[PDB]
């Protein structure tokens, strides 16, 4: 096993170390570069959301509801529960003539510290419509209604909408059904685990489909839907997360060049459209990147992802400088004295 | 290296893993049991506070201020900034005729989520007296005043109070000064790093001194002062942390049998008075335990510390059941469904 870490120090003394796994794959999922164990069996959590959104958009009759790009971005989101996210959740429920009572996700403290502060000040108790997964849940309800299935149990593994999700995830991974494992997520849906490189493969396919669409290529409905998902996330990155969130700041900085998505417990995935940077890495098409911090630390994840983009030459120093607060998180004490820092002793292997 | 972990799962699928280091030592610091690397160079952080409190109590003239056992417990604390902790800090300042403006620590968000919620609701900005380390800082200012040193720089390495702390830490560890490294803490004081087993040694000495005092044994001034610290922490565990906090609940459950203390970034130390349990582990005196979670996760620390007490046979099932919420942390989703749990794939080696 490779020994790839992100390390924090206090005065040069090692504080914490965090094991890093990463895969960099081409449009077919061939491994180009790695850290740690690039095939680590990994719970993709929210980083699987574009695959779930594909299952929703491929459900017959869902096109009739008129979901727009911002709605699809919300299906792909771990949003901050800003008022605009709650409003768009309600808009999507109304498009399918459903009610908040039909949701089978629950409320939680906001993924944004500033939103949660406003909630605490107002004694607000979040409900189902506030879930960071609310857009995905409305999409699943939409799919269940569109094919005339029951809506009560849309979130249960035996429901046809979850059969569609399970098949679609395995297909995008190029895995047999038996090679994808399933548990239950915080939002009470089935959630997949598969080798980490296949999360990179999903995002390589998203970016590859975006390149194919832009070139005016004849596309299957699946490739057209993957291109639409890429475009929706890149055009509405504030729907995918929210103000001050890594994913939103990353996708705004890159202005269409890539899409990026967090998974709970510190997974990350990026789909990179073909560029001078991807060609310099030795591939003639789109690229996927997937990362897992073994111990689940989110601060370390954002620092590593930003360091990996710098090492891969993705963006420019000016584009990546928008992410400086995440790349090198502050280690300043209560008296304004810098006491430590973050370092990246890992080495990409080709 | 041994492969000692604490793991979380979702439906039996590995979520996060965390490397565990631990030392179990006798009263002289002989290693009895280990996990991971028992000599890992480790920043003790707040787990060093009993050693710093010894340096304060061994400063000539500090006895004249009339600090009581709850004040000494506050010197040993990472408190939750409850109103009782803030009031006692200001009472301690009054005993030494010093003011909040003399403190060289700063305010921070409360270590208690429930306290921090109350602060957010009231727009409260914490100040120096709110520091979780405020009791240690007042004790250092007390020492500086008692010997007629300057107070302005009590926190600087060249100050006699820091010279006394540095010597006292090396003496309790039985280390040469050059084998203790120093950084700067969150509270803006020097903070020591030394091999993890020597943190266990400090706490074995605390508990050994408590045994000597209780048995009416003639004691050195250092052993009497260590026994006083042990008694203060065990009698006033709400000063050491606060309501709902692991350290307070642990020390209340054990009712004088042990003291325990958190260090930031997931170190922990316990001093165990001689008992049927310590004799069964193969020592005729007190025991020390020290733990570090490599990646710094606190939830995992409290789970591992509680698991270690069970494995070592310290306490009884009834005493340890008070800590069941920490031992086996809840993994319940937003809809009340249990999605996973914590497991302890580590093996104590003798
Ligand atoms: Cl949220
Ligand atoms: Cl700090
Ligand atoms: Zn979800
Ligand atoms: Zn401190």
Numbering used by the authors:
A (entry chain DDD), B (entry chain CCC): 3 to 352
Please give sentences taken from the publication describing this entry.
The orthorhombic (OP) and monoclinic MP1/MP2 forms show similar packing pattern with solvent content of 49.4–52.6%, whereas the monoclinic form MC, with a significantly different arrangement of the dimers in the unit cell, has 53.2% solvent content. In all cases the electron density maps have excellent definition for almost the entire protein molecules, except short disordered regions at the N- and C-termini. In the close vicinity of the Ser48 hydroxyl, there is a characteristic, almost tetrahedral pattern of three closely-spaced water molecules w2, w3, w4, visible in all crystal structures, except MP2. In all structures, regardless of the hydration state of Ser48, the side chain of Ser48 is also H-bonded to the Nζ atom of Lys51 and Oγ of Ser80.
